[PDB]
Amino acid sequence: CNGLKMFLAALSLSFIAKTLGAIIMKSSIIHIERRFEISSSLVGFIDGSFEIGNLLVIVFVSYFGSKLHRPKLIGIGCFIMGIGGVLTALPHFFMGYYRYSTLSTCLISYMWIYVFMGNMLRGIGETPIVPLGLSYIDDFAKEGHSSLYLGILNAIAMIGPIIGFTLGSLFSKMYVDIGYVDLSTIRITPTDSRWVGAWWLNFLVSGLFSIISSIPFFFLPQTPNGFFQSFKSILTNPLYVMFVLLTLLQVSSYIGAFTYVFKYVEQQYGQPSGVITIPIFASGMFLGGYIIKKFKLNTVGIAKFSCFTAVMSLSFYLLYFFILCENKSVAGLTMTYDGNNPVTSHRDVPLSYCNSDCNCDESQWEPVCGNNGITYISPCLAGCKSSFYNCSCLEVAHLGECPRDDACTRKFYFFVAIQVLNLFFSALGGTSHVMLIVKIVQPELKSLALGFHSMVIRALGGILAPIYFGALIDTTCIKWSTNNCGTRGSCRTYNSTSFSRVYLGLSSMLRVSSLVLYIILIYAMKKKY
Amino acid sequence: GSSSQVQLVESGGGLVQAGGSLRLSCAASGFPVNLSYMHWYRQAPGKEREWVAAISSWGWHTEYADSVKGRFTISRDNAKNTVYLQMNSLKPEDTAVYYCHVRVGRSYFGQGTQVSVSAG
């Protein structure tokens, strides 16, 4: 270890800490919503507090910290996210004890602020890690060694989610009042709807891990051996602006896909919603950095390598239109209730003569699977009178939806193979964004160019892309569920070809536009260099 | 905060008759309880600790049990570092030993005063 390797190890530990904190905040939020008795809008506000804290300071921290003691500011940020992790768990310590307390047959209050600001403090915590850290790495490393270091950092950052889901599953089974009550008196199970796990333990572990990872930065040297004018010079660079729009489109497609991969798998292939995926992603990230380092690519070479990986990723993505299994046959949604005549649409379908009594509820969704392979909406709509036996509408029934044929279970196995290959190719070009966006801009603007881009990716691709992906997804919903308060609820079944066409088409053209921007940017750097 | 632990003392327990009224005060000494929720529990004869009432840090939000709802009134005074429980229109089923509870770090309970209520 000759100075820079110590910084590389400490920044690796900070990468583990920040990804661990993200996974912990995502996983413990159900227990937080149950314990603090807060609504969905408030808990969404607490979730978005990290974005609110991060985005408003990332550009200014990246600009002003590039001239200061960069490892000292990274250690200050790790200390800050540690204090936020402790402050998130501090509501538990001084609130007191937690207190908690249809066959359908055919008939013939202010404590969340300590979470909120704490999560907001975590938003200020992760802020100096990517721009100042990566500028410190690639300013002082050997010529070509920085891509290998970033690939190693992104590979070892995957230890963080492993610890996160492991400790979340470990501390969810524990009661929230562990160490305070006699556990024999606790009657409820983790399967109970009133169960609250030890969510505070997650934040205490993450906070003290961030405080431990803050320690080695204060022992590192500064060197191993205007805002508006600089922001104008950044935003008038055409290569930079085209690269930021390009990677915004690509990462927007990534996030909008990965948010609803499991919903698409559930609706298209019928399977229920990272055991092998995480080593594949880590090996792909390290191998992409190693390819960049060993082949000694220049700026144009790194651009062609990233372009080729994303061309190959879309080339594998375009097979998704050919492995589409057939639509579900659900009585009363795609056909009539008797299954003899297809319907014109799914909006207010008429009832059939097999269940003309109908002392049921059409809004209630309890799917049942018949012997003919046709799922029904409810057993009460299915004509079943005893429990299910003597079902009237089966005449030309187990609980749950019908499992589909093995013919598209084979297509599902093809689909998860193409997902594995696609995630390998997408992780193969992860380093190239930072390498290109360093080499494009001026050398004293490396951090700010890494800051503002990190603002554009997390805002317009991190926040907005799941919103508009979900907006285009929800227009394919067939059976809508009415909420208890009558507000915007959730969807239960989707028109599978329509939902698939919208999802894969939106991802596909959002990748095609990025490929066009690749070709223009390759021509632009070939003309300029 | 050069202190050891929070000691809670209750006062105002006494005999009441019919649907009368009473006021139980809980004073805290030790760590500052200014950030913490302070609760009121009861102990019936032959029964475990029933939860009665709660107050927030600054008195913004009050949680009450469904056993006594609208008859009881919890309150806080952080300048003198005290909580109060006003009890009105009492029943003989309210005859219990009333404890005060705080959790500044560690769960801390009071000694409890007899709030025996006559029947008539």
XYZ file of C-alpha atoms in Angstrom:
649
model
C 0.000 0.000 0.000
C 1.576 3.237 -1.226
C -0.993 5.867 -0.281
C -3.524 5.559 -3.091
C -4.312 1.919 -2.263
C -5.322 2.983 1.258
C -7.708 5.536 -0.254
C -9.006 2.862 -2.631
C -9.765 0.511 0.276
C -11.399 3.288 2.332
C -13.537 4.412 -0.615
C -14.477 0.761 -1.187
C -15.643 0.623 2.428
C -17.667 3.813 1.864
C -19.234 2.291 -1.270
C -20.258 -0.747 0.806
C -21.635 1.581 3.501
C -23.738 3.690 1.125
C -25.197 0.726 -0.794
C -25.897 -1.010 2.529
C -27.689 2.099 3.791
C -29.781 2.273 0.616
C -30.821 -1.392 0.921
C -31.602 -0.970 4.647
C -33.754 2.115 4.003
C -35.621 0.260 1.259
C -36.168 -2.889 3.340
C -37.183 -1.466 6.744
C -39.816 0.914 5.374
C -42.752 -1.487 5.894
C -41.925 -1.835 9.593
C -41.470 1.951 9.806
C -44.907 2.536 8.240
C -46.471 0.030 10.646
C -44.740 1.341 13.788
C -45.241 5.067 13.243
C -48.797 4.522 11.865
C -48.122 6.911 8.983
C -49.887 6.933 5.627
C -48.552 6.082 2.174
C -48.042 9.713 1.128
C -46.046 10.502 4.280
C -43.853 7.419 3.947
C -43.285 8.317 0.296
C -42.227 11.776 1.480
C -39.760 10.158 3.902
C -38.461 7.975 1.052
C -38.054 11.010 -1.223
C -36.249 12.961 1.497
C -33.042 11.220 0.390
C -33.494 12.662 -3.110
C -34.371 16.072 -1.624
C -31.211 16.120 0.485
C -28.925 14.661 -2.185
C -29.917 16.698 -5.247
C -29.877 20.136 -3.642
C -26.270 19.796 -2.429
C -24.554 17.383 -4.856
C -23.585 20.006 -7.459
C -22.252 22.526 -4.937
C -20.363 19.880 -2.934
C -18.835 18.484 -6.139
C -17.743 21.945 -7.284
C -16.419 23.359 -4.012
C -14.846 20.170 -2.656
C -12.626 19.649 -5.691
C -10.271 22.352 -4.388
C -10.387 21.359 -0.705
C -9.121 18.297 1.187
C -11.134 15.692 -0.734
C -10.637 12.627 1.579
C -11.488 14.835 4.564
C -14.794 15.828 2.943
C -15.549 12.191 2.045
C -14.931 11.274 5.686
C -17.162 14.152 6.802
C -19.898 12.843 4.499
C -19.528 9.300 5.833
C -19.720 10.696 9.376
C -22.842 12.663 8.380
C -24.615 9.597 6.977
C -23.586 7.733 10.126
C -25.216 10.423 12.278
C -28.277 10.159 10.039
C -28.347 6.393 10.519
C -28.191 6.798 14.298
C -30.828 9.564 14.221
C -33.176 7.325 12.226
C -33.036 4.675 14.965
C -33.328 7.274 17.736
C -37.202 7.383 17.576
C -37.328 3.832 18.957
C -35.158 4.565 21.976
C -37.506 7.175 23.505
C -41.033 6.422 22.279
C -42.077 3.604 24.636
C -43.538 0.159 24.094
C -45.290 -0.766 20.858
C -48.955 -1.752 21.146
C -50.944 -3.570 18.461
C -54.333 -4.440 19.983
C -64.978 -14.726 3.457
C -65.726 -18.046 1.767
C -67.496 -16.192 -1.105
C -69.839 -18.969 -2.212
C -72.776 -18.679 -4.592
C -75.893 -17.919 -2.547
C -79.340 -18.960 -3.759
C -47.686 10.936 15.145
C -44.824 13.405 14.727
C -41.809 11.171 15.405
C -41.283 10.345 11.705
C -39.537 13.737 11.371
C -36.598 12.137 13.193
C -36.675 9.524 10.446
C -37.261 12.175 7.755
C -34.416 14.574 8.567
C -32.224 11.586 9.383
C -32.830 10.165 5.926
C -32.258 13.689 4.597
C -28.970 13.735 6.488
C -28.126 10.483 4.702
C -28.867 12.385 1.494
C -26.109 14.807 2.417
C -23.979 11.848 3.471
C -23.560 9.922 0.205
C -23.013 13.225 -1.668
C -19.175 13.627 -1.728
C -18.459 9.953 -2.482
C -18.802 9.581 -6.268
C -17.515 13.006 -7.610
C -14.733 13.810 -5.113
C -13.727 10.168 -4.716
C -13.544 9.362 -8.414
C -11.788 12.646 -9.205
C -9.259 11.834 -6.452
C -8.782 8.351 -7.905
C -8.301 9.308 -11.518
C -6.277 12.469 -10.801
C -3.523 10.556 -8.994
C -3.603 7.023 -10.425
C -1.332 5.611 -13.101
C -2.229 6.157 -16.753
C -5.013 3.655 -17.401
C -5.266 2.190 -13.887
C -8.347 4.201 -12.865
C -10.847 2.079 -14.806
C -9.623 -1.069 -13.034
C -9.987 0.646 -9.655
C -13.533 1.780 -10.461
C -14.460 -1.727 -11.611
C -13.070 -3.114 -8.347
C -15.033 -0.459 -6.410
C -18.293 -1.290 -8.183
C -17.672 -5.015 -7.688
C -16.912 -4.756 -3.959
C -19.866 -2.369 -3.546
C -22.080 -5.443 -4.089
C -21.115 -6.743 -0.626
C -23.362 -3.967 0.715
C -26.696 -5.288 -0.608
C -25.754 -8.806 0.570
C -25.268 -7.507 4.127
C -28.399 -5.383 3.694
C -30.835 -8.151 2.765
C -29.143 -10.593 5.178
C -29.469 -8.244 8.149
C -32.950 -7.155 7.076
C -34.171 -10.752 7.067
C -32.281 -11.358 10.324
C -33.672 -8.343 12.199
C -37.199 -8.594 10.774
C -37.818 -11.877 12.605
C -36.813 -10.247 15.896
C -39.474 -8.307 17.767
C -39.182 -4.517 17.883
C -39.117 -4.576 21.706
C -36.255 -7.090 21.898
C -34.340 -6.672 25.139
C -37.239 -4.747 26.707
C -40.055 -7.292 27.148
C -40.387 -10.950 28.036
C -40.613 -12.705 24.674
C -42.931 -15.475 25.891
C -45.673 -12.864 26.341
C -45.478 -11.860 22.662
C -48.164 -13.782 20.777
C -47.913 -12.392 17.242
C -45.791 -13.983 14.508
C -43.792 -12.359 11.683
C -46.600 -13.560 9.381
C -49.099 -11.447 11.351
C -50.334 -8.184 9.840
C -49.420 -6.218 12.994
C -45.818 -7.442 13.200
C -43.095 -4.820 13.583
C -39.515 -6.056 13.439
C -36.361 -4.499 14.843
C -36.109 -1.820 12.157
C -34.006 0.326 14.503
C -31.302 -2.358 14.548
C -30.908 -1.986 10.775
C -30.295 1.753 11.070
C -27.992 1.376 14.077
C -25.855 -1.171 12.195
C -25.775 1.041 9.080
C -25.011 4.172 11.107
C -22.140 2.691 13.093
C -20.810 1.072 9.904
C -20.777 4.503 8.254
C -19.040 5.981 11.315
C -16.396 3.207 11.178
C -15.935 3.810 7.441
C -15.561 7.544 8.171
C -12.489 6.897 10.362
C -9.681 6.074 7.844
C -10.301 9.171 5.709
C -8.987 11.569 8.357
C -5.585 9.819 8.317
C -5.079 10.134 4.494
C -2.994 12.902 2.883
C -4.336 15.507 0.490
C -1.909 14.425 -2.251
C -0.277 10.961 -2.425
C 2.906 12.469 -3.885
C -15.939 30.772 -10.331
C -18.943 28.480 -9.953
C -20.996 30.108 -12.708
C -18.158 30.325 -15.248
C -17.176 26.698 -14.625
C -20.810 25.562 -14.847
C -21.143 27.494 -18.120
C -17.979 25.854 -19.490
C -19.450 22.495 -18.482
C -22.856 23.116 -20.084
C -21.575 24.637 -23.335
C -19.494 21.551 -24.110
C -21.483 19.667 -26.781
C -19.800 16.316 -26.123
C -20.643 16.582 -22.416
C -24.281 17.610 -22.953
C -24.863 14.912 -25.569
C -23.194 12.348 -23.279
C -25.384 13.381 -20.319
C -28.603 13.174 -22.374
C -27.387 9.854 -23.830
C -26.618 8.230 -20.473
C -29.814 9.737 -19.042
C -31.832 7.880 -21.687
C -29.867 4.653 -21.127
C -30.080 4.701 -17.310
C -33.750 5.748 -17.566
C -34.399 2.590 -19.594
C -32.409 0.555 -17.029
C -34.340 1.854 -14.014
C -37.748 1.740 -15.698
C -37.095 -1.843 -16.743
C -35.663 -3.069 -13.419
C -38.496 -1.484 -11.420
C -41.091 -3.661 -13.198
C -39.146 -6.779 -14.311
C -40.807 -8.767 -11.515
C -44.294 -7.429 -12.300
C -43.748 -8.265 -15.979
C -42.569 -11.767 -15.013
C -45.640 -12.187 -12.788
C -48.067 -11.057 -15.468
C -46.527 -12.645 -18.584
C -45.155 -16.001 -17.386
C -47.108 -16.399 -14.139
C -44.047 -16.869 -11.944
C -44.002 -15.373 -8.427
C -41.832 -12.334 -7.755
C -29.894 -11.996 -6.898
C -28.521 -15.349 -5.767
C -26.574 -15.863 -9.001
C -27.092 -12.356 -10.490
C -24.783 -10.490 -8.066
C -21.574 -12.438 -8.974
C -22.485 -12.032 -12.669
C -22.832 -8.252 -12.241
C -19.611 -8.026 -10.196
C -17.653 -10.086 -12.732
C -19.082 -7.989 -15.565
C -18.116 -4.706 -13.883
C -14.594 -5.915 -13.088
C -14.179 -7.403 -16.567
C -15.293 -4.173 -18.238
C -12.760 -2.187 -16.232
C -10.107 -4.813 -16.953
C -10.875 -4.729 -20.698
C -10.508 -0.925 -20.679
C -7.220 -1.132 -18.761
C -5.611 -4.040 -20.626
C -6.598 -3.012 -24.147
C -5.393 0.572 -23.396
C -8.420 2.300 -24.904
C -8.426 6.042 -25.527
C -11.532 8.235 -25.216
C -12.801 7.126 -28.632
C -11.999 3.503 -27.783
C -13.894 3.634 -24.474
C -16.806 5.237 -26.339
C -16.835 2.455 -28.959
C -16.583 -0.203 -26.227
C -19.570 1.215 -24.312
C -21.488 1.644 -27.576
C -20.795 -1.970 -28.572
C -21.883 -3.311 -25.176
C -25.160 -1.401 -25.378
C -25.751 -2.428 -29.029
C -25.291 -6.030 -27.905
C -27.577 -5.385 -24.913
C -30.376 -4.067 -27.145
C -29.702 -6.880 -29.634
C -30.407 -9.327 -26.827
C -33.319 -7.175 -25.585
C -35.106 -7.331 -28.948
C -35.737 -11.096 -28.559
C -38.419 -10.307 -25.951
C -41.077 -9.782 -28.631
C -40.783 -13.413 -29.793
C -41.082 -15.341 -26.503
C -44.443 -13.857 -25.523
C -46.748 -16.490 -24.054
C -50.465 -16.291 -24.809
C -52.964 -14.215 -22.845
C -54.650 -15.520 -19.718
C -58.204 -16.776 -20.091
C -59.991 -15.161 -17.137
C -63.781 -15.389 -17.028
C -65.415 -11.978 -17.012
C -62.285 -10.095 -18.112
C -61.195 -11.383 -21.541
C -64.313 -13.436 -22.316
C -67.776 -13.655 -20.828
C -68.443 -15.356 -17.506
C -69.587 -18.593 -19.165
C -66.534 -18.661 -21.446
C -68.534 -19.106 -24.656
C -68.291 -15.649 -26.267
C -65.365 -13.190 -26.275
C -66.144 -9.672 -25.085
C -65.656 -6.419 -26.964
C -63.781 -4.809 -24.050
C -63.247 -5.151 -20.304
C -65.312 -2.081 -19.342
C -68.555 -3.100 -17.560
C -69.066 -6.585 -19.005
C -72.525 -8.179 -18.613
C -73.190 -11.022 -16.197
C -74.035 -14.589 -17.294
C -76.956 -16.902 -16.565
C -74.876 -19.381 -14.533
C -74.727 -16.903 -11.622
C -77.862 -14.791 -12.121
C -78.560 -14.707 -8.372
C -75.205 -13.004 -7.644
C -75.105 -12.177 -3.937
C -71.442 -11.318 -4.444
C -69.091 -8.358 -4.868
C -67.581 -7.636 -8.277
C -64.801 -5.525 -6.746
C -63.580 -8.450 -4.628
C -60.684 -10.307 -6.277
C -60.119 -13.854 -5.002
C -58.992 -15.809 -8.082
C -59.859 -19.500 -8.393
C -58.596 -22.042 -10.930
C -61.068 -24.371 -12.623
C -60.587 -27.830 -14.073
C -60.745 -26.484 -17.645
C -57.710 -24.221 -17.203
C -59.764 -21.005 -17.043
C -59.273 -18.768 -14.018
C -62.368 -17.105 -12.566
C -62.521 -13.730 -10.818
C -64.144 -14.992 -7.612
C -65.652 -18.285 -6.425
C -68.900 -16.372 -5.892
C -68.877 -15.405 -9.571
C -67.782 -18.958 -10.446
C -71.064 -20.496 -9.282
C -69.442 -22.530 -6.507
C -71.957 -23.155 -3.725
C -69.930 -25.243 -1.252
C -66.271 -25.400 -0.266
C -64.879 -25.658 -4.037
C -67.704 -27.937 -5.179
C -70.751 -27.642 -7.476
C -69.585 -24.661 -9.540
C -72.247 -23.631 -12.045
C -70.161 -21.558 -14.461
C -67.632 -24.359 -15.014
C -70.287 -26.245 -17.015
C -69.811 -25.751 -20.756
C -62.184 -25.420 -8.708
C -59.147 -24.781 -6.504
C -58.058 -21.558 -4.838
C -55.473 -19.450 -6.635
C -54.713 -18.629 -10.245
C -54.150 -21.329 -12.855
C -50.501 -22.228 -13.498
C -49.764 -21.994 -17.194
C -48.351 -24.466 -19.704
C -44.766 -25.699 -19.757
C -44.539 -24.402 -23.348
C -44.045 -20.846 -22.112
C -42.344 -21.971 -18.920
C -39.599 -22.841 -21.409
C -40.002 -19.274 -22.709
C -39.643 -18.063 -19.109
C -36.348 -19.945 -18.806
C -35.255 -18.332 -22.081
C -36.313 -14.977 -20.595
C -34.222 -15.345 -17.440
C -31.255 -16.490 -19.546
C -31.555 -13.316 -21.629
C -31.892 -11.269 -18.399
C -28.646 -12.818 -17.102
C -26.860 -12.089 -20.392
C -28.353 -8.572 -20.585
C -27.318 -7.651 -17.029
C -23.823 -8.980 -17.751
C -23.556 -6.762 -20.834
C -25.035 -3.739 -19.042
C -22.598 -4.112 -16.147
C -19.797 -4.618 -18.689
C -20.073 -0.944 -19.656
C -20.600 0.628 -16.242
C -17.087 2.074 -15.867
C -17.153 3.658 -19.324
C -19.611 6.411 -18.345
C -17.291 7.803 -15.662
C -14.168 7.260 -17.802
C -15.699 9.108 -20.765
C -17.180 11.891 -18.672
C -13.794 12.493 -17.074
C -11.891 12.459 -20.371
C -14.367 14.732 -22.176
C -14.302 17.688 -19.757
C -11.428 19.889 -18.589
C -9.134 18.286 -15.966
C -10.007 20.802 -13.241
C -13.739 20.167 -13.837
C -13.643 16.393 -13.266
C -15.633 16.508 -10.026
C -18.343 18.962 -11.133
C -18.904 17.020 -14.357
C -19.215 13.941 -12.163
C -21.549 15.844 -9.840
C -24.042 17.452 -12.215
C -24.373 14.227 -14.215
C -25.066 12.451 -10.927
C -27.759 15.080 -10.425
C -29.266 14.421 -13.869
C -29.212 10.616 -13.538
C -30.849 10.467 -10.104
C -33.466 13.155 -10.822
C -34.667 12.688 -14.391
C -33.779 9.000 -14.616
C -34.038 7.906 -11.003
C -37.290 9.628 -10.000
C -39.150 10.433 -13.220
C -38.496 7.189 -15.114
C -40.361 4.835 -12.693
C -43.194 7.390 -12.689
C -43.688 7.498 -16.450
C -42.968 3.769 -16.833
C -45.717 3.093 -14.291
C -47.982 5.616 -16.014
C -47.662 3.790 -19.330
C -47.956 0.430 -17.557
C -51.205 1.263 -15.725
C -53.114 2.031 -18.937
C -53.057 -1.706 -19.750
C -54.836 -2.698 -16.525
C -57.973 -4.796 -16.994
C -59.269 -5.311 -13.445
C -58.933 -2.241 -11.233
C -59.217 -2.482 -7.451
C -61.205 0.085 -5.482
C -59.501 1.470 -2.385
C -61.041 1.719 1.078
C -61.004 5.526 0.825
C -62.021 5.435 -2.849
C -58.742 6.976 -4.029
C -56.150 5.714 -6.534
C -55.598 2.039 -5.705
C -53.610 -0.705 -7.411
C -54.040 -3.061 -10.360
C -54.620 -6.816 -10.235
C -54.602 -8.140 -13.826
C -53.171 -6.659 -17.015
C -53.773 -7.316 -20.694
C -50.613 -9.361 -21.127
C -49.816 -8.632 -24.784
C -50.722 -4.951 -24.338
C -48.677 -4.620 -21.131
C -45.769 -6.492 -22.730
C -45.958 -4.378 -25.901
C -45.916 -1.108 -23.941
C -43.146 -2.209 -21.542
C -40.719 -3.782 -24.037
C -41.500 -1.151 -26.676
C -40.846 1.779 -24.344
C -37.580 0.211 -23.174
C -36.625 -0.653 -26.769
C -37.148 2.800 -28.311
C -35.568 4.440 -25.261
C -32.511 2.295 -26.077
C -32.728 3.052 -29.832
C -32.583 6.813 -29.186
C -29.465 6.285 -27.059
C -27.922 4.252 -29.899
C -28.575 7.131 -32.311
C -26.902 9.485 -29.836
C -23.999 6.981 -29.653
C -23.521 7.106 -33.428
C -23.632 10.921 -33.453
C -21.225 11.111 -30.493
C -18.792 8.614 -32.062
C -18.804 10.732 -35.225
C -18.334 13.888 -33.127
C -15.319 12.542 -31.230
C -13.854 11.136 -34.449
C -14.173 14.583 -36.030
C -12.814 16.392 -32.963
C -9.938 14.034 -32.125
C -26.302 15.975 31.451
C -24.472 14.768 34.563
C -27.170 12.350 35.699
C -27.509 8.648 36.467
C -31.077 7.564 35.634
C -34.612 8.908 35.475
C -36.641 8.527 38.678
C -40.366 9.138 38.349
C -42.436 10.105 41.381
C -46.225 10.034 41.416
C -48.508 12.173 43.551
C -52.206 12.876 43.812
C -53.414 9.337 44.434
C -56.304 9.113 46.849
C -59.777 7.819 47.535
C -62.617 8.972 45.276
C -66.335 8.249 45.426
C -68.754 7.670 42.515
C -68.196 9.529 39.252
C -65.764 12.003 40.784
C -62.476 13.454 39.639
C -58.778 13.195 40.425
C -55.443 14.422 39.083
C -52.257 12.339 39.136
C -48.917 14.084 38.695
C -45.636 12.468 37.644
C -42.385 14.357 38.186
C -39.182 13.246 36.465
C -35.634 13.623 37.768
C -32.447 12.594 35.986
C -31.925 12.585 32.239
C -34.057 15.150 30.377
C -37.381 13.596 29.422
C -38.039 16.583 27.154
C -37.535 14.485 24.012
C -39.443 11.411 25.164
C -43.026 10.187 25.331
C -44.227 9.689 28.904
C -46.992 7.140 29.418
C -49.538 6.274 32.082
C -50.172 2.600 32.910
C -52.452 0.968 35.454
C -52.367 -2.276 37.456
C -55.703 -3.860 38.293
C -55.909 -6.380 41.160
C -55.255 -9.765 39.596
C -54.388 -8.330 36.177
C -51.283 -7.177 34.330
C -50.229 -3.678 33.258
C -53.048 -2.141 31.262
C -51.984 0.844 29.159
C -53.987 3.996 29.855
C -52.588 7.118 28.225
C -49.622 8.720 26.488
C -48.278 12.178 25.659
C -45.750 13.321 23.067
C -42.514 15.217 23.631
C -44.103 18.670 23.371
C -47.724 17.645 23.916
C -48.657 17.789 20.234
C -50.080 14.255 19.954
C -51.846 12.258 22.672
C -52.627 8.533 22.541
C -55.463 7.316 24.773
C -56.709 3.820 25.532
C -60.129 2.654 24.402
C -60.960 1.694 27.997
C -61.113 5.367 29.033
C -61.695 7.616 26.009
C -62.830 11.190 26.559
C -63.139 10.773 30.333
C -59.392 11.000 30.938
C -57.163 13.951 30.049
C -53.387 13.716 29.837
C -51.240 16.846 29.882
C -47.599 17.879 30.032
C -45.663 20.797 31.520
C -42.033 20.649 30.421
C -40.940 23.757 32.348
C -41.543 21.994 35.674
C -40.863 18.633 33.934
C -44.144 16.980 34.902
C -47.064 15.148 33.326
C -50.602 15.148 34.682
C -53.570 12.828 34.240
C -56.954 14.391 34.989
C -59.609 11.736 35.551
C -63.307 12.589 35.424
C -66.539 10.586 35.895
C -64.771 7.607 37.406
C -66.012 4.022 37.551
C -65.183 1.330 40.135
C -63.489 -0.574 37.282
C -60.847 2.190 37.248
C -59.626 1.102 40.714
C -55.962 0.454 39.975
C -52.404 1.382 40.864
C -51.358 3.998 38.317
C -47.749 3.985 37.119
C -45.811 6.612 35.195
C -43.443 5.442 32.465
C -40.634 7.073 30.493
C -38.042 5.533 28.170
C -35.115 7.938 28.082
C -32.705 5.295 26.827
C -33.868 2.643 29.290
C -37.465 1.822 30.185
C -38.220 3.494 33.512
C -41.298 2.947 35.671
C -42.778 4.693 38.682
C -43.678 3.303 42.078
C -47.425 3.748 41.646
C -50.047 5.262 43.922
C -53.372 3.751 44.963
C -56.247 5.407 43.096
C -58.866 3.296 44.887
C -62.375 4.368 43.880
C -65.456 3.716 45.995
C -68.644 2.286 44.497
C -71.963 4.065 44.968
